[PDB]
RNA sequence: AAAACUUUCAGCAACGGAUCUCUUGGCUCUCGCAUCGAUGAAGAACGCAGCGAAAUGCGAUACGUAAUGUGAAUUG
RNA sequence: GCGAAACCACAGCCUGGGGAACGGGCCAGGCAA
RNA sequence: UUGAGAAGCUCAGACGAGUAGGCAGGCGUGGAGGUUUGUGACGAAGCCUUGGGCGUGAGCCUGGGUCGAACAGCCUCUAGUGCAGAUCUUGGUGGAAGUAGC
RNA sequence: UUUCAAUGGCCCGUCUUGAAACACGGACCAAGGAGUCUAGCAUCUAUGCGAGUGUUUGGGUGAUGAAAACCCAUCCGCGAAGGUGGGAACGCCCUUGUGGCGUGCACCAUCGAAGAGCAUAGCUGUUGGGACCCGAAAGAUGGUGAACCAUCUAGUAGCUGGUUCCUGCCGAAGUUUCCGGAUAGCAGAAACUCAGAUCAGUUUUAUGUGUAAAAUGAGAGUU
RNA sequence: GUACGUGAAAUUGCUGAAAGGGAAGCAUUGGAAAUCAGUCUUACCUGGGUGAGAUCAGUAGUCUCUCGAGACUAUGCA
């Protein structure tokens, strides 16, 4: 999986800075719309009150 | 490919005429000894997949256009390239203010508006 | 704005080419015929010449007043009356253009349409009559020679009681 | 009958999309067989242990050469055997213990996409399956 | 060729929009003064009393 | 990080904020659509090179 | 065959109070706290307002007094 | 003048045959004002 | 040739009763997270109407009249979610009937 | 849309009955109104991990609801305790094709003696729990003046009546057989192996009506 | 308009309409009366003249980007 090694840090003024960070390994992990749905589906029922 | 329909009349519910508690919405009669469900003569018809219309003509108005519901003036813009097949239906709750914005924009765009004369009034 | 905006599926090459029409044998030029439909229905008219579909035909203006007109062969009864020489008249000038309906033309300025003050009249041109008067001058001499023919065209076709078109050939 | 996986692993609907094209555009039975097994349920795809794979390639006359073992399903390891042999393996999934053990001592692990770009016709590949009885 | 095909159609279809916008501006097309449900009712009742 | 295939498998099928569910066809509200419909060849987000 | 009467459909007026919108109410869960009476409690009755129909409030110091505040309203 | 309750699928000429009652509807009939 | 929503587009042929029952795709209601940079005093929701349409259908979109403050399409979550019956519960209303009668 | 003209069409639901006949329930309209919530078990599928597996007893933590999210210590639960041929797939060919030579998975025959779970979610099934909804005299405790009241009580049902939107596909059995049942059969649903293989509410041929071996068709057989 | 938000169905009264020999009822096919659906040559192409503008100048500047790609400000209209 090859993609975009470095990201650029923006200062307060909005101008780019010469420093850069390697794109973290997490940013290549699988993207799963079904698995996020069936986990958000569950995790969102966890702040419920009983009636 | 012209707009031809296998049937005009709607399917009414059986015995929906006699009663008023019985709605005219088609309900399948599940009666065990129901002769009207049994397809006897002098009875009513019943929805079948055999009554479907041409797949290149389904959803098509009698003038050949398919109705497309535009809420705001953004929606009327995307019918730029399908004006020969779709007609900009204006939603029922769109106010008379934006209703003119939708009709004037659609007139120049070249698309056909179906309810362009509602709640408004012309002035010369 | 010429590059086809939509898909616009084009008509496939249809394998139909126009061929000459074939008319009935009795429809040969110079045949008395019973006009069936139109404002001049019921008259009797001779066939000057054939056309693509119709028959360019006219009755004697000095007898019946039927002008040269395209009449479809289907709306014409082919009568077995003795044939009349029609070779004399010049039939070549009779074309589709001659019988063409005047083009929807003659634009008017957008003030005269209001108040209805531009209405012209398409009243029949004289040469159209002069064409027919020549045709009469070439068919009226022909027809009087045949006895009762001139009166036969004058008379109006009709059916009495107990008339069976199939039984009595026209 | 089975012509659409019951799965919703979005990447398995991309793997099938690759082997639907390969199956119908090549004359090999490896592709037609691979595509079928990408439709099978999780129950019908048993885990196949590393030791079972190690025995199959190094079976009888051995002569493993450099054939690639291919299995649709996981490849769980076998700590009960110490010395793993050199192996080229293609599978849907590995286990982090197994994949390290293949990588550390010997060849390499592959996913079904890296096998396809190497042997689209199933060229010199052993297609194995785990014990179904379970 | 598919991608260049769709851009040419849009350029065709956008030009016809710009043309139609021009001709409509030239013609003295009628305004569309809308209708109010409150003023229509109030004038309807005030009339009947008159 | 940039794949026309995974991006489409999310937007095309799970949820894209521009799709309008029509009766026969889906229309795309995205301003950069050359066709105005929701397709795979048309959609501006999946196709990495677009005009 | 018209009227009368009977029948269907439409207009209009009654009748009825569904629907829609809400809502100083209900229910549910969590959270904090420890406080009745022989020094007469809970409960009940009778009273009491510049006038109260219920309703609250109050006890012959009666829709409360003292005291501390707020600072000009009660309101049919 | 003051005024119910019961009841209510809907109706209501028969003649016969209509096989399972069929007459309260079906077909042959007459009647039908 | 543009026809990659590959869950798409396209081609060919046969076929079509249905109870018990099995399988599949959908329509609709209340509310929930996301969304339409959604609609709404220039009129939301509702309601009626022989207005016009859409769907085989469940249903839907719209015109007019009333109306006056909210509401919806889409992807998922969720349930006190769909009625013609139950001598069903509650309310309303008729014929009977200006009758029995007082 | 109303109406007319010609052709037509026995009241719906339930129950009964092969079927009806029936007997029921229905004066009309609106609203309310009946497989639900939960623990256990098994199955199918989906997901995460995989000889492992499971954070939520609890602790750590969470400044923008802090009953969420996020993190892991000590246990614990559930798992863990060889040849022969037929074979999927592949390579080598080589008269190529045909096939052979092989390597032979799952598994099956044979001779024989290289773990696949755990957890979550769903579906259908089953057992309990008030258990789809409605309906049987109760009985008991304790009170009030044989009677009456209140609760336990969601006491008890094989039975009665009812159980709510659309379309599409498949669609029986209606009964053998042993014996209220286990079988079977029909219908499905899955997994397999083959069309160069078997078949048939089939027909012939012929040997002695049965049996065995030609046509006519259909791919057939298993778990 | 205090029988007071919206005001549905059943149900009743008035009016207009058609229909009305012991039913009605609905379905097909039309007809008739009554009523709505929707109307559109107009644009395209070509020819010239006339004034223009600019994405054009055998042209001059600024702004943001990445030479030239945009947004403009002059100036001339070839």
From Swiss-Prot, chain A:
Highest taxon of source: Eukaryota
Q: Where does the UniProt annotation locate this protein? A: Cytoplasm
Residue ranges of the TM segments? none
Q: Please give the function described in this protein's UniProt entry.
A: Component of the ribosome, a large ribonucleoprotein complex responsible for the synthesis of proteins in the cell. The small ribosomal subunit (SSU) binds messenger RNAs (mRNAs) and translates the encoded message by selecting cognate aminoacyl-transfer RNA (tRNA) molecules. The large subunit (LSU) contains the ribosomal catalytic site termed the peptidyl transferase center (PTC), which catalyzes the formation of peptide bonds, thereby polymerizing the amino acids delivered by tRNAs into a polypeptide chain.
Family stated for the protein in its record = Belongs to the universal ribosomal protein uL4 family.
Q: How does it assemble?
A: Component of the large ribosomal subunit (LSU). Mature yeast ribosomes consist of a small (40S) and a large (60S) subunit. The 40S small subunit contains 1 molecule of ribosomal RNA (18S rRNA) and at least 33 different proteins. The large 60S subunit contains 3 rRNA molecules (25S, 5.8S and 5S rRNA) and at least 46 different proteins. uL4 is associated with the polypeptide exit tunnel. uL4 interacts with its chaperone ACL4 and the nuclear import receptor KAP104.
User: What else is noted?
Assistant: There are 2 genes for uL4 in S.pombe.
Protein name from the UniProt record: Large ribosomal subunit protein uL4B
Organism, per UniProt? Answer: Schizosaccharomyces pombe (strain 972 / ATCC 24843)
Describe which stretch of the whole protein the shown chain covers, with first residue, last residue and complete length: 2 to 52 of 363
UniProtKB/Swiss-Prot annotation, chain C:
CDD domains, per the entry = KOW_RPL6 (cd13156)
Family matches, as Pfam families: Ribosomal_L6e
PROSITE patterns recorded = RIBOSOMAL_L6E
Which keywords does this chain's UniProt record carry?
Cytoplasm, Nucleus, Phosphoprotein, Ribonucleoprotein, Ribosomal protein
Q: Phosphoprotein: present as a keyword of the record?
A: yes
Q: Which Gene3D superfamilies match?
A: 2.30.30.30
Q: Any S-S bridges, and between which cysteines?
A: none
A molecular function annotated in GO for this UniProt entry is: structural constituent of ribosome
**Residue numbers bearing the Phosphoserine modification:** 80, 90
Record-level GO cellular component terms: cytosol; cytosolic large ribosomal subunit; nucleolus; nucleus; preribosome
Primary location recorded for the protein, binned into one broad class: cytoplasm
Q: Where in the cell is it found?
A: Cytoplasm; Nucleus; Nucleus, Nucleolus
Q: Which GO terms describe its biological process?
A: cytoplasmic translation; ribosome biogenesis
Describe the family membership recorded for this protein in Swiss-Prot or TrEMBL.
Belongs to the eukaryotic ribosomal protein eL6 family.
Subunit-level organization: Component of the large ribosomal subunit (LSU). Mature yeast ribosomes consist of a small (40S) and a large (60S) subunit. The 40S small subunit contains 1 molecule of ribosomal RNA (18S rRNA) and at least 33 different proteins. The large 60S subunit contains 3 rRNA molecules (25S, 5.8S and 5S rRNA) and at least 46 different proteins.
Its biological purpose: Component of the ribosome, a large ribonucleoprotein complex responsible for the synthesis of proteins in the cell. The small ribosomal subunit (SSU) binds messenger RNAs (mRNAs) and translates the encoded message by selecting cognate aminoacyl-transfer RNA (tRNA) molecules. The large subunit (LSU) contains the ribosomal catalytic site termed the peptidyl transferase center (PTC), which catalyzes the formation of peptide bonds, thereby polymerizing the amino acids delivered by tRNAs into a polypeptide chain.
UniProtKB/Swiss-Prot annotation, chain D:
- Cite the entry's keywords alphabetically: Cytoplasm, Phosphoprotein, Ribonucleoprotein, Ribosomal protein
| UniProt GO molecular function | RNA binding; structural constituent of ribosome
Q: Which residues carry this modification: Phosphothreonine?
A: 74, 76, 121, 125
Is Ribosomal protein one of the keywords? yes
The PTM Phosphoserine maps to 3, 51, 123
- Biological process GO terms, please? cytoplasmic translation
User: Domain of life here?
Assistant: Eukaryota
What are the record's GO terms for cellular component? cytosol; cytosolic large ribosomal subunit; preribosome
Q: Where in the cell is it found?
A: Cytoplasm
Q: What is its main location?
A: cytoplasm
Would you identify the family this protein belongs to, as annotated?
Answer: Belongs to the eukaryotic ribosomal protein eL18 family.
- Quaternary context: Component of the large ribosomal subunit (LSU). Mature yeast ribosomes consist of a small (40S) and a large (60S) subunit. The 40S small subunit contains 1 molecule of ribosomal RNA (18S rRNA) and at least 33 different proteins. The large 60S subunit contains 3 rRNA molecules (25S, 5.8S and 5S rRNA) and at least 46 different proteins. eL18 interacts with NAP1.
> What is noted besides the main data?
There are 2 genes for eL18 in S.pombe.
**What's its job?**
Component of the ribosome, a large ribonucleoprotein complex responsible for the synthesis of proteins in the cell. The small ribosomal subunit (SSU) binds messenger RNAs (mRNAs) and translates the encoded message by selecting cognate aminoacyl-transfer RNA (tRNA) molecules. The large subunit (LSU) contains the ribosomal catalytic site termed the peptidyl transferase center (PTC), which catalyzes the formation of peptide bonds, thereby polymerizing the amino acids delivered by tRNAs into a polypeptide chain.
What is this protein's name? Large ribosomal subunit protein eL18A
From Swiss-Prot, chain F:
> What does the sequence similarity comment in the record state about its family?
Belongs to the MAK16 family.
Q: What is this protein called?
A: Protein mak16
| Record lineage | Eukaryota, Fungi, Dikarya, Ascomycota, Taphrinomycotina
Q: Can you name the source organism?
A: Schizosaccharomyces pombe (strain 972 / ATCC 24843) (Fission yeast)
Task: Please indicate which superkingdom the organism of origin belongs to.
Answer: Eukaryota
Compartment annotation: Cytoplasm; Nucleus
